[PDB]
Amino acid sequence: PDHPIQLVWTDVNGRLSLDLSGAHDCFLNTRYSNYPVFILCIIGEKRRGKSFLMNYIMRALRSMEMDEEISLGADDEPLKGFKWSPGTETTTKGIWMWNRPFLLNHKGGKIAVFLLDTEGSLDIESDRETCIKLSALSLFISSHLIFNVASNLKETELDYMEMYMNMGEECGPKNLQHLDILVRDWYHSKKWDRDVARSYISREIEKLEKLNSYPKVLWSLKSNQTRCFLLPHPGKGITGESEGRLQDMDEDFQESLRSYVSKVVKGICTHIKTNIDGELLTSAHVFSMLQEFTEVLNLQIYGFSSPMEMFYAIKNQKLMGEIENEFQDFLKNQSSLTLPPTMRVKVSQKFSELLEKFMQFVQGSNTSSHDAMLKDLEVRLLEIQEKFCNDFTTR
Ligand SMILES: Nc1nc2c(ncn2[C@@H]2O[C@H](COP(=O)(O)OP(=O)(O)O)[C@@H](O)[C@H]2O)c(=O)[nH]1
């Protein structure tokens, strides 16, 4: 009985918890463990139709799995999410996924398509750091991210997008992070004009070019790497009480949804992701990356206010560890027969140089986190230095 499963939740203390058994049963089944995997994620504001679009994309994927044509019936009831929220039930917040993948055919192989809904993100101020960490975990394992927006792009959303752009830099050789900005309720009827979409795009690109911020999303927009899709209002047949049927939809919304679902489920085969090793990603790889990035986020104890800031904090904590190891190795190379005075001079100078190197290689502009990291690095290197010297006493 295929059902939705909650993969990652946020504990009361802010730690990110993972369903190890569920992720093992989903990503490591012997059937599709080595099939190339494709994770589709929907991030956006609540009550905007993310689960609805995911359910229709799911029906299209079922059609593709059984035969070869994308079809959706005119009177069929929904499945998963809210469009088919269980009679008298609703949903929780976190990362949710479809327990069973969808196997498609591409150039002699089977692609395992996983559907990931991020019910709960883009908060106003309700536990901001934890929401950032959850959405970052989602964006880390995603091969195609659909950002469900409701108007012009907001700073929060643009920062999330820049983070998604940056979180694929060491995930493959020439990895292109594919992003689909889905604007909801942008127009009513009016059929469609290819003018409204490129007008939205022109507005956004002007805003970003003046911002001198969010540069990589700006490049992706001006390079047609990230694509924007603007569908009309669903109509009162979907809003409120409804069984999410296409007979309950506006025909313009129906056709726009069909076009978008075609876009999304027909570009999977043409955009498989490669890892740094040069191989294609599989579901077991995704399980491993899930665990690894969950623990990486649970260990980011420094402060941040934006997604990009948490990205830079991850990187700078890694820099801290690298400098610690460099100092320890420098001390390991030092002889036990060196002149103690010149030895203390040398070690103090390595201390100073490593601190300056941290300062020159730090990333981001949050000088507060920079100072905190430098202070803690100073304390650790001081411990290392005094330890080496203390042992040098008895020698
Ligand atoms: N305004 C609007 N509502 C929609 C759209 N698609 C679905 N809805 C409705 O908005 C409600 C919330 O849907 P939901 O799937 O739960 O969105 P989600 O919470 O972000 O995942 C549902 O009852 C849908 O029927 C849309 O394109 N625009």
Side-chain angles (χ1 to χ4, degrees):
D2 278 11
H3 57 86
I5 181 47
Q6 197 179 17
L7 282 183
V8 202
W9 67 95
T10 292
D11 208 316
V12 196
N13 298 310
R15 192 169 214 85
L16 259 81
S17 297
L18 216 176
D19 184 24
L20 283 135
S21 155
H24 184 54
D25 199 349
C26 294
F27 291 114
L28 270 67
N29 194 353
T30 76
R31 303 211 315 105
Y32 35 87
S33 277
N34 206 237
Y35 293 145
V37 83
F38 182 83
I39 315 277
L40 184 58
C41 197
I42 182 74
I43 207 89
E45 297 180 5
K46 165 160 224 178
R47 311 158 183 178
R48 277 329 191 300
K50 301 195 305 290
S51 311
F52 185 91
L53 175 59
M54 277 322 216
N55 304 334
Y56 267 102
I57 290 177
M58 244 173 72
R59 281 163 47 158
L61 290 173
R62 286 177 184 273
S63 83
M64 294 264 269
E65 202 185 22
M66 218 172 215
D67 191 304
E68 205 75 6
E69 66 176 351
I70 307 166
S71 176
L72 319 95
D75 80 286
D76 208 334
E77 318 86 290
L79 296 174
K80 164 192 191 181
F82 199 132
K83 171 191 163 243
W84 195 58
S85 58
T88 71
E89 339 293 335
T90 185
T91 295
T92 293
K93 294 310 138 283
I95 298 189
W96 292 79
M97 200 201 39
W98 204 240
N99 64 3
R100 207 259 309 182
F102 289 70
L103 290 317
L104 318 193
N105 306 3
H106 150 263
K107 290 167 68 71
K110 301 294 290 295
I111 312 178
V113 182
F114 285 85
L115 281 205
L116 205 84
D117 197 339
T118 36
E119 229 62 18
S121 46
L122 276 289
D123 72 332
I124 39 170
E125 208 289 305
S126 305
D127 294 12
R128 190 187 47 184
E129 290 201 352
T130 51
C131 294
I132 305 283
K133 290 189 176 176
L134 211 52
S135 308
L137 193 36
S138 323
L139 272 47
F140 188 70
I141 71 176
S142 292
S143 33
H144 191 86
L145 179 74
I146 302 172
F147 215 125
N148 211 32
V149 295
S151 185
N152 284 321
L153 298 178
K154 309 182 166 335
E155 229 71 329
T156 89
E157 315 177 308
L158 286 165
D159 211 83
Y160 271 112
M161 278 153 36
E162 181 82 16
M163 203 211 200
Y164 180 73
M165 296 287 82
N166 272 222
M167 304 209 335
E169 290 175 349
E170 307 114 301
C171 194
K174 203 29 190 303
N175 188 345
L176 288 148
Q177 301 278 102
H178 318 294
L179 171 76
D180 268 353
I181 301 174
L182 198 76
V183 200
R184 311 291 285 256
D185 316 346
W186 196 243
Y187 68 92
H188 295 69
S189 62
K190 177 65 181 178
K191 192 198 175 193
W192 192 44
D193 198 355
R194 295 189 311 181
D195 307 350
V196 292
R198 294 298 169 170
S199 174
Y200 184 96
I201 314 302
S202 63
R203 277 267 301 170
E204 292 296 338
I205 62 111
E206 177 177 9
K207 260 191 109 173
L208 259 47
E209 264 285 358
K210 184 32 40 173
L211 282 188
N212 201 27
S213 179
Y214 313 124
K216 286 204 227 214
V217 303
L218 174 36
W219 168 90
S220 99
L221 291 177
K222 284 192 179 184
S223 303
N224 206 31
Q225 194 267 295
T226 51
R227 300 160 118 69
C228 293
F229 217 68
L230 307 82
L231 52 152
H233 196 269
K236 289 327 207 233
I238 286 320
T239 325
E241 49 159 49
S242 154
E243 299 176 16
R245 288 155 326 145
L246 303 85
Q247 80 164 260
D248 305 347
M249 285 173 1
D250 305 9
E251 251 308 330
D252 290 352
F253 175 84
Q254 180 160 355
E255 286 321 293
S256 293
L257 194 78
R258 270 226 181 70
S259 315
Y260 185 64
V261 170
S262 154
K263 309 270 202 263
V264 184
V265 306
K266 295 181 72 166
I268 297 181
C269 308
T270 93
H271 282 119
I272 311 296
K273 261 215 289 173
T274 305
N275 61 2
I276 52 182
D277 315 350
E279 279 81 305
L280 297 195
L281 268 296
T282 76
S283 47
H285 304 178
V286 167
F287 179 77
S288 60
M289 320 170 56
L290 209 72
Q291 295 184 132
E292 164 64 341
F293 204 58
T294 309
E295 287 325 303
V296 160
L297 296 171
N298 280 341
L299 199 50
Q300 188 49 79
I301 55 105
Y302 294 66
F304 57 91
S305 78
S306 71
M308 263 336 282
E309 261 188 25
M310 204 204 42
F311 185 77
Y312 287 134
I314 304 330
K315 260 38 164 163
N316 295 339
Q317 217 171 13
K318 221 199 63 152
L319 215 178
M320 260 166 81
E322 270 188 356
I323 296 303
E324 295 152 65
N325 276 10
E326 172 165 347
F327 199 37
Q328 274 274 21
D329 275 338
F330 167 86
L331 291 195
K332 182 193 64 60
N333 170 272
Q334 302 314 306
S335 152
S336 299
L337 325 184
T338 326
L339 204 65
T342 40
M343 179 65 206
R344 284 209 199 61
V345 188
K346 232 214 190 163
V347 47
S348 295
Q349 293 193 335
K350 199 62 177 184
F351 185 84
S352 297
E353 211 87 292
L354 289 191
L355 289 179
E356 183 195 17
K357 175 185 178 178
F358 184 110
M359 263 312 114
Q360 311 234 287
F361 258 73
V362 84
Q363 284 176 319
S365 40
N366 194 7
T367 54
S368 182
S369 266
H370 293 357
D371 193 25
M373 272 159 197
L374 206 84
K375 281 197 144 263
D376 289 341
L377 177 60
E378 261 214 7
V379 152
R380 270 321 298 170
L381 301 183
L382 225 49
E383 239 295 0
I384 304 175
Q385 183 180 28
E386 195 196 22
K387 197 235 170 153
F388 176 102
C389 294
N390 293 346
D391 282 300
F392 210 67
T393 64
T394 52
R395 198 176 333 164

